[PDB]
Symmetry: D2
Subunit: 285 residues, 4 copies
């Protein structure tokens, strides 16, 4: 059990080609375990902006409209406290029975746009179904992805799904996340998409990975192995990227620049990573 | 604007039978929904032989789920009956020239612009724009989508499965109501029109079954559409709405079980039932509210 | 070197019955092939009632097709019986090459390096390299492919259809012999190993049926492989080879008809038939020639 | 009607070779009863041993060579070619030639292939085109549908793209237009095959792909891109689809630096031809 402090930042610049509405998701989330000490959102030129959330409330969206032949920039900066628990997984030998799951966990057993878990049940069972420990099973999924999918910039696009990546064997963090989720759900393990800022991510960027519901806790997993698991600051969780796009654009516009940063404010940061030989899960709670 | 309001009274029933082969958990979606416009006068759920059952909803609250677990080599039957009151409006659509702006949409409408498991609207933008993009009136555009589907997709029992999506149906050109609903939704979303999946009991549906169609958000109202043209629109009793069938399955099975029997019926109890059907030349939309 | 079998003698039979819904043309592929190594001592083909029938082959000559037309709302049966000898070599593979020398292959082998309808080898290159790329000799590579399929794809009747391809089976992980053959072929071609589809009658196949597997071109010989492991490899009587099932369908149906009865049988006429199977630890390839 | 013409064709490509690589190229003009090569020249620099071969079907001339690691080479093909086409009345093509009457060598072109999943498009093709009586008018309706409904966009597709993809994607280049026309023909039980060639008046100059359908005993040329006069084509290959007619099949690791194609007419009275909807005339290279 540890508490961490971070300073996060993103800014994005767009050239707008025709009348365009934007929905962004860059704000740190406020949860019981994650607190924002201070934040600031600035757009230049100054355009009216509104924050809203879905009923689920696991992301903070901001929306605005911009007129044609125009450019603007949005800058977000915040100081955030996170905490996590490291939870022993030794006795995680059966999934929480479906009849006992909280009502709001249930949707995370179901297929979603980028996570066609209903097409991967036999595959997931053939590959991972013999692994008795639930945590070990999800970890094996994550290790299989790391070892069998190449991390290749530009190999995929926003249409790419888990069902594609499982045969294409190339992708980026969004695709690694969707694939882990689909394989978990295929084994009846609730799983959700997680986006955030990531300390030590190089080159710095928004990051996507996932959480699996094991023994009553959401446990973080990241098949890319790009980032220490304790360096993440949560932006959103949801079913998949459909619920957590950095920017949804209704109109014609493209980004001309983007910067993302996450810095620790703790003096002596020590990275946490998973290992096959250790039955310990990290949970943001 | 102009609208007519109508109140309707129905009797609805469903029963399903399962053979269970392994330890199995079920989540069912058979209950009529309680909303501001739809009232359940009475209902009974019976599982024979009696198993422990629990009702629950997602946070969104647009469906009533019930879950029970079964032991291996069991046979059980579940029965639902209710008498339900519905209301709807018939709303003038002549002035619906533009979609409500995305900046002005309520937070809880926004998710219905996005692709979902069975509605890959992000893959159908070009196709959708070519076919329908020049149609000026939003309602007429959705009705054109609905009419295109009826005329170009064949209704065939057993042609699809639970894996089938809008993206498949667009090339397969055959399906049942679930596929017709998914495709209408995907084509609406491809054109930046919010749309959602609707399931319910359907009066005059032959052969009697659960029915699925869709609603599109036009001028601040969810307007119902059904590309199968199988049922009078005013004869529907709402079970659920959601992004697609992932959010509104009749039964999600965790284990190994198969249905052997299904009966679903819906009857009008009003003194005079008058079927409501769209006509291309009538710019009026039916809305359950 | 190679070991040469004695002449293997078999009696083969198939019969099929169709109900014809509309005017329909059939192209069947049921005759045993005549090759330098496989001889038909006797054959008989009976259509009930007698319908005019013509045998033809493609330019390639690796299948014997027969075609007939049938009128709407009728039924017919076709019965094929033959006595056939085959011979095979068992070829040591211990000196297997690191790769297939593409620049030196006979021109008639080259086509079997390319993707086909049911074998999308071009979509499976990264996957095949990831899974099998480290294995150092061609024979061992194909055998590993064959063993991987047996171990990771379930044999399930009725789980697939004629549209199913290698690209589907690689994620679906269930199929019947046609699917196992297409997947072995796709994975071989993905690794630059020529491979082709093989159909035949199969001694000791239970339940009795037409059988499909594949052959890879290794060290100048077509070596047979069967990832289902259902049949002794030396019990096969060849019907056709081609790129995939598009070139070797049991029945291609132009119109509307479905089969109502089907029987396939193969029996050895030899005194002491001893089954040949591969073991991962024998570098030996069976080849029909 | 019959007409002939003369063309000078040329292609050259340069490769950088990373690891030991074998190439199979298909750039040569075909020799057919119809098409005659007056002269041709193939030069590779630096000279690498090169061998010409054909498949049993003989509808393409391939050349193959192997290059060693860390080298570059250039290949240059030049030829002078005569082509002839017939213009064939299609007014009486009211039914497809019965499958029972088709020659054995036509039959394979009824079947699905890698890039032409005609088995998955049967209902769609019937719903869209099935009521058109004349077989030529039906293929023309397919080509016009493709032209009007699929955007020609460079770089929108790749070598894995198929007719089944294009039907929903609604964008592609000539290879995709060719595969989709073929898949739709086969879905309607009309034999169809892929055609590659040099193309006069193609701008920018390049290899071109289209298709032919077997109608009433003749292979009739179609091109849904409408980019080129149909009588400006010099045939390189025919096959079931692009899997049988790749410009370059590469076994190893190498990338093309540059590819330059030219097709010039050697007649000064070239008149470019395309199809009109209400005329029932087909062009056939035979």
């Amino acid at each position: 059990s540890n508490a961490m402090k971070f300073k996060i930042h993103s800014d994005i610049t767009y050239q707008v080609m025709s009348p365009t509405t934007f929905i962004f998701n860059v704000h740190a989330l406020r949860t019981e375990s994650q607190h924002i000490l201070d934040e600031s959102l600035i757009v230049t030129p100054p355009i009216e902006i509104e924050e809203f959330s879905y009923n689920s409330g696991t992301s903070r969206f901001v929306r605005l409209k911009a007129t044609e032949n125009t450019t603007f920039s949005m800058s977000y900066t915040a100081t955030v406290d996170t905490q996590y628990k490291v939870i022993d997984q030794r006795q995680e030998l059966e999934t929480v029975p479906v009849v006992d799951l909280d009502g709001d966990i249930i949707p995370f057993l179901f297929p979603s746009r980028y996570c066609q878990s209903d097409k991967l049940q036999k595959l997931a069972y053939k590959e991972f179904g013999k692994i008795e420990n639930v945590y070990s099973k999800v970890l094996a999924i994550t290790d299989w992805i790391y070892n069998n999918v190449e991390y290749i910039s530009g190999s995929t696009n926003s249409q790419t799904s888990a069902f594609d990546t499982i045969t294409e064997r190339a992708g980026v963090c969004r695709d690694f996340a969707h694939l882990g989720i689909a394989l978990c759900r295929a084994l009846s393990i609730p799983a959700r998409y997680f986006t955030g800022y990531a300390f030590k991510l190089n080159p710095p960027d928004f990051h996507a990975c996932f959480e699996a519901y094991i023994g009553g806790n959401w446990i973080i997993f990241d098949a890319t192995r790009l980032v220490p698991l304790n360096g993440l600051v949560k932006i959103a969780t949801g079913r998949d990227a459909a619920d957590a796009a950095v920017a949804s654009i209704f109109g014609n516009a493209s980004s001309t620049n983007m910067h993302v940063e996450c810095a620790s404010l703790d003096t002596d940061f020590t990275p946490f990573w998973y290992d096959k030989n250790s039955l310990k899960g990290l949970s943001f709670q």
